Amino acid sequence: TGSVSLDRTVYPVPFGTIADSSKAANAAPNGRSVFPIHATGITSTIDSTEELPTGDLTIHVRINDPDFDENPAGEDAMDQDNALKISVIRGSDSVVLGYAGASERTGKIDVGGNNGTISNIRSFGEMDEIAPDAGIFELDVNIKFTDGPASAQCNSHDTLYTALDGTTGKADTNRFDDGAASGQEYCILQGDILQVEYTDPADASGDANTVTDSATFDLRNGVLQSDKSVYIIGSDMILTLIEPDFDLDNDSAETYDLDLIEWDSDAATTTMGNKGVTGAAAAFDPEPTDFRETGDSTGIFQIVIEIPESLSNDKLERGEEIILEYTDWGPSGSDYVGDEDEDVNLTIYTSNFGATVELDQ
Amino acid sequence: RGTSASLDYNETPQTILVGFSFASIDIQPVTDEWTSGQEIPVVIVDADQNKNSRADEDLDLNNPDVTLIPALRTGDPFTIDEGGTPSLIFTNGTNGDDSIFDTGAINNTSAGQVGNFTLNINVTRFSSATNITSTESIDTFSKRLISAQTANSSANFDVDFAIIDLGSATLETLKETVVDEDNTAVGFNFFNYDVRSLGADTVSIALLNTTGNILPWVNNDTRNVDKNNAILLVSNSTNSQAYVDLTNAVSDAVYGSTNTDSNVNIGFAMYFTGVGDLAAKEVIVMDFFSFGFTDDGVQSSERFANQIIRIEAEETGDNTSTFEGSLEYVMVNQINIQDAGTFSGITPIADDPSFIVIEDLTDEDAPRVNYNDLGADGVTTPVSDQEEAPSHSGVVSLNADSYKIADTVVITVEDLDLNVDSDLIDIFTVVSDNSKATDDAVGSATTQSLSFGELGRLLDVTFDDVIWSTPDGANNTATGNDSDTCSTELSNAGITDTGLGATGFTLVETGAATGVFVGDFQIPSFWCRVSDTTTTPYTYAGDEETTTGLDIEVNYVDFRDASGEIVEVGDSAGVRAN
Amino acid sequence: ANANLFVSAENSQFDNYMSGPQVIEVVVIDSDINDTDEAKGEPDVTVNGKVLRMVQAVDGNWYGYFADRDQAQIADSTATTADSGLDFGVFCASSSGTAALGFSTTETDGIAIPITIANATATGNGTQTGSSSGGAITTTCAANTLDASTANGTINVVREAKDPVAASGSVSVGQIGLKNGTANSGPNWPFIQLYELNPTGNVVVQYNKGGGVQSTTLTFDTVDQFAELSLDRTVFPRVSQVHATITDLWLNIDPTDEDSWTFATNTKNTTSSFNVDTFYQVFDENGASGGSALTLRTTLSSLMCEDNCVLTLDVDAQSSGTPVVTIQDNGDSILTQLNASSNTNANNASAFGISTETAKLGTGSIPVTITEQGPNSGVFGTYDESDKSVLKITDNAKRGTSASLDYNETPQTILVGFSFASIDIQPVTDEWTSGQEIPVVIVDADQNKNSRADEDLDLNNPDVTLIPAL
């Protein structure tokens, strides 16, 4: 019997960039699927150098079919045509991402399987066996924030759809078999169910059989953490960020700009990154230079930061209130990325001790 | 299989059985981890390839008799069969003056390497007075093209041209592997070809692009549908085996046409001399290679390494079915990622080939070698083996917690991924170039600015968290509180160790394959502090200060951590004084 | 362990392999037939079953030289001028031995004699150059070709053949009937008998004598697995001689002579017309004029040279503007600093070249000459009998900077560095009283610049930079 499995029970909602929207440049997302820096990092307009890269999450599909393991100690590939179907469902409406198992070919996105002709559907190619004696085939497929059912909640962004066929146009028909309904745009919302369809050519009974695995899209709040509350100026700050939705790929550890966090104190207010004030990023000397995820399937991001003795042309004082605030853009109450702009901050104290002065006599 | 002949002597006939054997390709690392710069044997046991019991049989792509060769590939390299089954023909005649084979030359010039291909055909004296067609076959793993044709070897036979079309392949099927070197941050294109079976004195290869059919070919004087249809790659090479770096002209010409890439086909051309005899079977192997990364290059989507590797296994003994080979792999680092020599220095076709690894390929993506085989039953079942090539977290530390003046500090860097050859001693020099932002840093002069810092920055030594650099360039004119310049002050103090480059501090590997690099230098009494690191060349302070009491810190830039990404690690120490 | 038959290619170091245009010397050192005054017979020596004509020399040993026909023809195709390069002389048909050499040579595939042709007919005279594509030869040679020769001794692959036994009474020249017996300068001796051999196929040399035959097996295949290059040390001081030991079987073309090869190793001379090349017998083994230089870069492919017959040199791996390796004139070379301008010095390796062959070995190109350590050892060295290397580390070399030398496509790095010394005074007892000579021990690897000789410190020697003082 064939079986299909997914890496994670839940997956984060993908996010796009400014170039994926036809709206004019704005200092705020204005409901778009954009993940920019905290307001102080943007100068009146969000451009390509001040937002996170494209957030197409890469889901890996795995099947366990010993029938396709024809070679016990050799390479095997699932060559059955269109045996795997990847689709996204939101209630009563369904959209299919593509087909797998046949030869890789160019195609558009079908909605609800309305297109009878299968050659017009995008094909991801034949899945490759993970190990010569395993029998499990894995295919890596990325899902864009546009690859979802049409809805009116996503009209806030005049989305530009990347073409999946040979044409270079950015129109809706280039990526999807049919244009979106007037007043609605293709997108993925919170709570949407991601499902994988695999048709086994031969089960234990040697006939056709359909198996399914499901995952749910979700968005979670972000919370900072530190190993301790007080810090000596110039010491090492183990800044730990625990937030699930940044774990886009379970097979690798991604990196994200430190600019998402901001320095807020009496000395200065800066994003502590390359987009901050002059001489800022040097003061902390990040190691690594950006937020780095602890493990490929953990979702926790950590980075070593040094407490600056001076932020920008002025020193940092003892007992100063240190505020580390970052904007999630994806809180629990957000239907999608860029809907709610909730911010979360952390309080950090500096070392205070008695500076007693004594004389010999 | 199974049909046999009976040879009889002394009225005791012996039966000559024909047959096949179950093979088993195995990769045996010398230890429990296949780290970079470690040549490990590859053992292939296949009695089908042992066709002579009194001699040694060596596998060869150029030998049509050797039907099956093990192969390894990563990414999507552009082989000869990416567009399906190709069509190859042979032609005799003259190229003429309006041809890229004669007028063209390798000079990285648009006119020099890109032009038009024209020819005239005189095949009346040939059999049937027609172009020499052939039967084309492709191997599933080595991707070798085997050409079957009439085995005419008469003295009057003379053939010069050879035109081959890659089935339905187009510029779209080529741009997935061939990348634009001008637009990508880091990217190189390589062309590997093997035409040794032809036995030609000189070999010339050109790339053809046209919106119509390749067979039969046309001429400029006949039609003007295509503005340009010839891109010269190899011109009169004396070696049939060559792995040459393509010039930027080829990459520009690939993207140099404004027409639709899907509406124009691609063709491959051959011109050679001294091939007046053709065997029954001929083999043509010529693929495209590509390596590099785009933008920040931290995610796996922007890291690509398209190559195909074939192992030339050699028989162990005269009558031993065990064929022995070996695999080499170098893990690319931040220093050699911008140098085309390290990509061109690998051997694609040899008994001990080498290949590039861009990411800590483990689990399902581990480097896997493929080898077809005819089993004892008679099916062509494949046998494959894989070995993980993970990365390691570089650790750098100093021998002591505190150091005196001229205490001869030594830097010990243990990271097995920087070993790029098990034979040669791996070394890393220090950059001495004021113009580049990586001045006085270990690495290479070439450097690109990214989100993780400088590409050419490998290791730095810092006093008081300030990089130790020698005053140079036009930004060292500051004199400070006095009228003496920092460089002049250091010269007066007698400190010839004005910087990292002055000391000659370089990283040298402990052994051939140890993977641990040892470097050392003496701490100077006086050093020149850098006023600001935000400009190149660095602007130095006008007065020197004594290094005692300051904390000496090193920073080894690790291009690939244990998970296979950039992690900044260093060690700390203090310059003691009494 | 043969008793009488000795073959040049027989070598346990290189496992009896043979490759390229090598001429193989066959000597039969037999005490039973060593005398040269009696009308003795020719010993029965055959290779692969084909008889090999033997000539008795003044030393009482019978000599015979053979080589592959295709390889010999391909090599002679590069002999633009006579007595230069891999010149095998003039080829003739196997049936022409009786008319030319005076004795039958039917059982061979062609003979290469050092004659020259004055009437170059298309039928009655051999090929002075030979077909570049190889294959069988049908051109015949006759007595009139001998009588019309204007220069005898064009063969340059066998240069030290022994003098044939002079004719006297009942004994003919070589006891087999050579017309002219002048060795190394005549038209008959030496001459090579060509044979058809198969690459990767064994070659069996046979000597038939009473009481038991003696047979030697040689393998005729590419020998790249044995071509290796080694350096005497690992770290090299500022001025130390750079010694190269080239253990290559293929380079031993002449068995009876020490062989000299010249290479153009400049890997960064980006001139279009210049390419890395190899040359044969530019200089003699004594450093004299060895003849003209001829191209071999485009011919090595057909000469069984799989990445084992080319030399290229890298002088600055890091391209830091500090050259590391340079070249000099030696006793086995005639190198000349063409760029004698006072602005530059001996460190500019591109300033050196060869006057006679400036066309390809001119300024730049780094002309490098190597000579064999022995006539038939198959091991070549840059260093001469005076220990003066062809390569030096530059005196102004920056510490840490290294150069790499390339042979067999196996780079060899030439690092630059030093070692920690320790000078110690060890008295014979617990007190250093007057009139007691006590040893002084200095351990310094920097001053040990030669691994095959004794280095003595000297104030008068500028090379000895550092001397202890009190």
Residue numbers in the entry:
A (entry chain B): 1013 to 1373
B (entry chain A): 435 to 1012
C (entry chain F): 37 to 506
Paper lines:
The structure shows that the S-layer is pseudohexagonal and consists of the repeated interactions of the Nmar_1547 (hereafter, NmSLP) S-layer protein. Collectively, our structural data reveal that the S-layer of N. maritimus functions as a multichannel exchanger for ammonium ions, featuring negatively charged residues that line several pores in the S-layer.
Our goal was to solve the structure of the N. maritimus S-layer directly from whole cells. As a result, we produced a high-resolution map of the N. maritimus S-layer hexamer from intact cells. The central region of the S-layer hexamer in the map had a resolution of 3.3 Å, with the resolution decaying to around 4.5 Å towards the periphery. The subtomogram averaging map contained sufficient details to enable us to derive an atomic model of the S-layer. Each monomer of NmSLP in the S-layer adopts a rough ‘cashew’ shape, facilitating several interactions around the hexamer of NmSLP. Although the amino acid residues (37–1499) from the first eight Ig-like domains could be unambiguously built into the subtomogram averaging map, several unexplained densities were observed, emanating from surface-exposed asparagine residues. Another notable set of unexplained densities was observed near the negatively charged amino acid residue side chains of Asp73 and Glu74 at the central C2 pore, as well as between NmSLP monomers around the hexamer.
